[PDB]
Design a binder for these strands. Structure first.
Length: 180
RNA sequence: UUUGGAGAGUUUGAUCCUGGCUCAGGACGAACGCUGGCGGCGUGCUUAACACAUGCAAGUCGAACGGAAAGGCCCUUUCGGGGG
């Protein structure tokens, strides 16, 4: 199972001596709802064709996300061509607060409680690319403790670890009610 | 030692960017239109500090005083009234 999107359809036109040889584009985002996120800019004369290209290309170019239960670690600035985005964690029960593009991205990714803001380059393309850049700038605290040699306790505060423990508890609960 | 930000359209054969314009939300001591069962609590000259009829809006003390017009009591009487 995969979640899939269609969040942009423009009607493009190369121009040639006869006239306008139109074509169709699409922007497609895929996400398992758990951390996998993929992106694709498909195009064709046919809208289903472009959509299917976007689907398969997203299924190619996944990217895993440093999540915590249902929310990100830290706020971040993501730069693309000109897409600026200021993501920032929420407190649970808040909602997937964003516009159209980033909302699609994060809802497909699996986020449920997060903030966001577009500050430049309103175009969905660059907006998505900037959001992705931000998600790449993210870091897991485990990998932070790894790269700087210290342990998680000196590396993180206590509230994040509260969240870790409680979310692991809910997850083990869900899985042990499911199978066991 | 913790809490809370959403965008869409628009220049172009088509694109991206800068950049402006417009829209959705909320607030009123409000007014206009259509409609108009009730109750509770609140609220009403933002303009001409323009003019003003009319009536009430700061009086009180006889345990401060001299006194005695109406009130009251008695002396009375013609009941005219007259004295305390």
């Amino acid at each position: 199972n995969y979640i899939e999107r269609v969040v942009s359809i423009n009607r493009v036109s190369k121009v040639v001596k006869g006239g306008r040889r139109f074509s169709f584009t699409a922007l497609v985002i895929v996400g398992d709802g758990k951390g996998m996120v993929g992106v694709g800019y498909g195009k064709a004369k046919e809208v289903p064709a472009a959509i299917a290209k976007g689907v398969e290309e997203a299924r190619k170019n996944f990217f895993r996300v440093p999540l915590i239960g249902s929310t990100i670690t830290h706020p971040v600035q993501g730069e693309a061509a000109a897409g600026v985005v200021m993501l920032r964690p929420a407190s649970p029960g808040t909602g997937v607060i964003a516009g159209g593009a980033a909302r699609a991205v994060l809802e497909c990714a699996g986020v449920h409680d997060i903030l966001a803001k577009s500050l430049g380059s309103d175009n969905a393309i660059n907006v998505v690319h900037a959001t992705v850049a931000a998600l790449k700038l993210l870091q897991r605290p485990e990998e932070v403790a790894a790269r700087r040699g210290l342990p998680i306790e000196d590396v993180a505060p206590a509230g994040m670890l509260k969240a870790r423990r409680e979310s692991e508890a809910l997850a083990a609960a869900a899985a042990r009610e499911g199978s066991a």
